[PDB]
Design a protein around this ligand. Sequence first.
Ligand SMILES: Nc1ncnc2c1ncn2[C@@H]1O[C@H](COP(=O)(O)OP(=O)(O)OP(=O)(O)O)[C@@H](O)[C@H]1O
Ligand SMILES: [Mg+2]
Lengths: 544, 152, 485
Amino acid sequence: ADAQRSHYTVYPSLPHIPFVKLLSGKESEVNVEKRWELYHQLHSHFHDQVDHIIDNIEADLKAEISDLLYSRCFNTIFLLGSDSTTKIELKDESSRYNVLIELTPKESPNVRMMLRRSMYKLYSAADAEENDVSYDLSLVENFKRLFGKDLAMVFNFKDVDSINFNTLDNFIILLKSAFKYDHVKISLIFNINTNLSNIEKNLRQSTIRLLKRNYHKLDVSSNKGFKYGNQIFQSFLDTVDGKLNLSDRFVEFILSKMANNTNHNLQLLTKMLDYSLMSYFFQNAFSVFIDPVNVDFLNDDYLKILSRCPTFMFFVEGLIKQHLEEFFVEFLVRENPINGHAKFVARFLEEELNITNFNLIELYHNLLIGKLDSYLDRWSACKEYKDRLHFEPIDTIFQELFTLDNRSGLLTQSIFPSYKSNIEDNLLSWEQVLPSLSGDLDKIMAPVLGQLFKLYREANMTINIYDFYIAFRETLPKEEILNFIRKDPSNTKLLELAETPDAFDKVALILFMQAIFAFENMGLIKFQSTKSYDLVEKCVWRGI
Amino acid sequence: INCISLGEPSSIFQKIFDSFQDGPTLQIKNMQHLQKFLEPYTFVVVLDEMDRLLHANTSETQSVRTILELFLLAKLPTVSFVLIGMANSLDMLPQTIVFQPYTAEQMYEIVIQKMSSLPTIIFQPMAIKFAAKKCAGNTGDLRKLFDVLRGS
Amino acid sequence: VIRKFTKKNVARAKKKYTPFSKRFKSIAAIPDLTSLPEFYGNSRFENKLKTTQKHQIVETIFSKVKKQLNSSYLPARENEFASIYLSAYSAIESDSATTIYVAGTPGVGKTLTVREVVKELLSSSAQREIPDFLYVEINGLKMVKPTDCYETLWNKVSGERLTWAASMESLEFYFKRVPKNKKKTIVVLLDELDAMVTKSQDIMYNFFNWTTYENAKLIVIAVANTMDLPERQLGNKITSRIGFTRIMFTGYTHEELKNIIDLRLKGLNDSFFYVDTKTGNAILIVRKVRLRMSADAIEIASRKVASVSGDARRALKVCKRAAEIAEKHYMAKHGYGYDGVQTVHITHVMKALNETLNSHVITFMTRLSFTAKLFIYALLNLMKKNGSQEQELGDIVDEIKLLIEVNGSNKFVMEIAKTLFQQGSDNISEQLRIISWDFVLNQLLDAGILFKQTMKNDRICCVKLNISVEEAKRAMNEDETLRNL
DNA sequence: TACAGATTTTATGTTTAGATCTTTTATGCTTGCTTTTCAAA
DNA sequence: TTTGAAAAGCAAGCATAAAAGATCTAAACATAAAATCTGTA
Ligand SMILES: Nc1ncnc2c1ncn2[C@@H]1O[C@H](COP(=O)(O)OP(=O)(O)OP(=O)(O)O)[C@@H](O)[C@H]1O
Ligand SMILES: [Mg+2]
């Protein structure tokens, strides 16, 4: 049995797009193929600009690291908020070899391993460009005697917050011994993810005095000044300009979920925008109508479901208070210039007022509701240019058929679910999971996990297991269970066990114990012993 | 295949392979290569002293590790594999056969049948029964009986 | 290619890897290994330790006695000899494979009896009552690695040099598959069997499982320390295969040790020598000097050694030490250097026997300095008050300080307090430790008097006495100063 | 045959991941006693 | 407005889990000389 094994490879037999037919199965296959192609031409258009933004931020980070690095002590650079993913490339200084040595806390169990890995890397690089030596600091001593050139070592410490600071400290005083050699220049790069006050209290004061003689802070992250982010958001807006609308609830959900992630918020933003575009091109049959080519096959179902619109209902109520398909086509040529307004406001903030620290997503939020003035009042420099920079949000009929919105709770169920709470509400309720349609037992007897979770919830923090078994046993009908266990006459041992007078005390106990070990596997309960199984204590409370 | 002559317990599949072929020589380091070698074809391996195949200084799970890989391939469909694993009880699902330690009458029958080749029986019968009774009970060894008669 | 480390001192033997099972086409194609030149054994270093002597060295009367009592140069082993010879002769004659288990205490003549059995079997095979056999001797303590036995025995059988795994499979194939008419009987002595015990017991099981094979013709004589070595350190398979009939070598009685020593000194006791009085050289048949060693001295040495161990080495060494003591006194009184009745008396035997019985622990602690004695005395006071058997070093420091400051009217303490706390000097401050504190601490740790815990805090590190408390007190009771306080 | 190169075997050193046992310290149950708000008059 | 009374807090003591680490080993990683296998020649 391969299910009783660790890993097995199988090759399925074989005797094509995942998009389904909408409009309750009435949509044609050509609309499905068109919706597939339109989703891919928007998706590729967004992600190409994402690729160019990622390449640009990597290249600019390399450029500023090189500028800080090349402008009888260390040259120290603290990269604050660094996730240790940067490739630090070094120029080929003439008559001198520049060597990069990277160190991981897994590669740093002690000072000896740090030096041996560093010196092996140095000797490997020096032989790869230009008899063996001892992997030791005497190679730094005899580097000019063995290679002719002099040396410039750049140490990049990946993930300094996770390293043992005693080992790093002793490695720093060990590297300090190379200052008495005339041909040696040493630079250190510390990738700090918390702040500098955590690392100045873990090193010794002599180490701090050693590192103070030549050091540069550089706070480089994704939240630094909001530049990279706003570029991704503007790329997404330029992808959907003229075809799609962003709801204010969608933008505020983006702001709320991007507030809760600091180190990796950019690809989170890309992920939420990607799943929103996937949701729109999977749900809406009007997704083919974002270009004017596909307006030639609007059927009765399209006119039926575009008539259930609040904006259209408000518009026709206004017309009947004052006073179909061609009129619906007429609402496609309009511009909706809010994206151009947002990029014009961003350019006016950037290169007129020299304001860079603004969030374009929150600016788009305040433009979507209409509270741009309260957002622009904070800088105290747009007092006289606020009227020209303000424009009213226009209302367009049938906007909600072309709209990325968040009203159903889909985007907070697939990307940021209430996982523990979902398990708890599935276990406690259980009629919201299983359908209400053993024909008699399913209407009176609960599933064993759901029935056990009720007495789990209403008990105390430490539970005696036998009284918990008794409280499980009082919730079960013994006569209906014995009738259901006698339904199949083809099993002899079941029938000879059922007529035994303690059959229900066997059945309820073993269903109870399989539910107890299921609860132990999920992690709801634990045992307050190792050799005994007499008392449990619970670790999971609902609602937290 | 006796298992003390193995170097590593993980090499037994290779010892299974080299016991059958001449030809080509392919490296066997898991049971999968053995399974694909025996797949296009039956084969009986008799693993004596299989208690050596347990790994020392390894957690219960990893210690039993190789042996069930010896056994679960013996419970696979479309492979022609029969495993007969003889092991000593004192030192330590497949079908289990137990060899009970001999009693006095069985040892008497073994001794008389085994020196039935000799023309003249130099032992008295009650001496053989006394030696068999003294070499009996729990852990009844026929080697002990042979040593007792040789010492006599 | 840049190497992550180098092994520049590799010394690899020229030993081949192909075993014996793959050098012939089949079992029926193997030739007669008895009629082969390299099989069954069919010294180059002895010249290197010879020089020219240019002095006539003077050998006194006791020199022949001391050379006579050496272990290198069997009245009491006749039943063990008979049992081992009968078992080995019956196994050689019947082409059988067997195990002979022998165990005993050191020096009771196990190796000597096994070698005499083997020499008598070779003498019997020389005049053709038994088939010819090979003799292999493997000592477990003379192996660098335990698997070298595999490399040794096969090299004695085939003359080939292989690696240990290949040798093991070669021996397995030779013992199991080669027919008995095609091979020769091999008798292997396994000396110091406890040194061939590994964690997995591969070698023990292999050596005693080859004896259970039909075609093996292998006789294994296993020599060990104790009877219950298989029942303690071996599995039930090896204990079953070794067997139940195990041969005890009990210690010698005093009559047997006396007979061994008298059989050594048979030709030179109560004898006459020509001794030149100017130089002392003695020649067996200028003064005719009669040499004797008394039977009462030998008797009581045999009684003491037989009560202690039964070791023939110990009895021979006690007699040799008595002869050495007598020769030292003789060469002292006669002015004899190195180039009418001489008796090895009973007092020399009793001087030899008590020399390993006098204890230098009390003598060593009696002649220590005052500060080391003060350390030991303060440690004894701490063991008296708190009763811990392990005292902190800071407690010893404060107890030494307290013992100094309480007995401040004692004349010796008044004379020596400035020495302990200022080294007799102004411009040296009052010290927190006494002078030579770590010196006497390391001195008592070097002697094995103390045990010190491995801690880096000097105060709460504990120190334990490694010797008994009454000999320490006894040594403290000899001193005139520490008796008074 | 036959020799040069490639691969395997056997042997040893280097470093990491993890198990097992021992010792000292935290924690939880038990029993007794005292404080303090809570449903009822 | 009281009022007694049960929920809750404090403390000592002992059994026991658990952290910290001393000691050790298996396995991954690494090198390397002699034997052995191909592979043409
Ligand atoms: N029966 C004996 N007769 C004479 N000399 C003996 C006798 N037994 C022992 N010796 C002497 O004692 C020496 C030590 O004996 P032997 O080497 O046989 O000891 P052993 O019992 O094998 O001890 P160990 O366990 O230390 O190897 C011998 O070399 C010999 O000089
Ligand atoms: Mg010996």
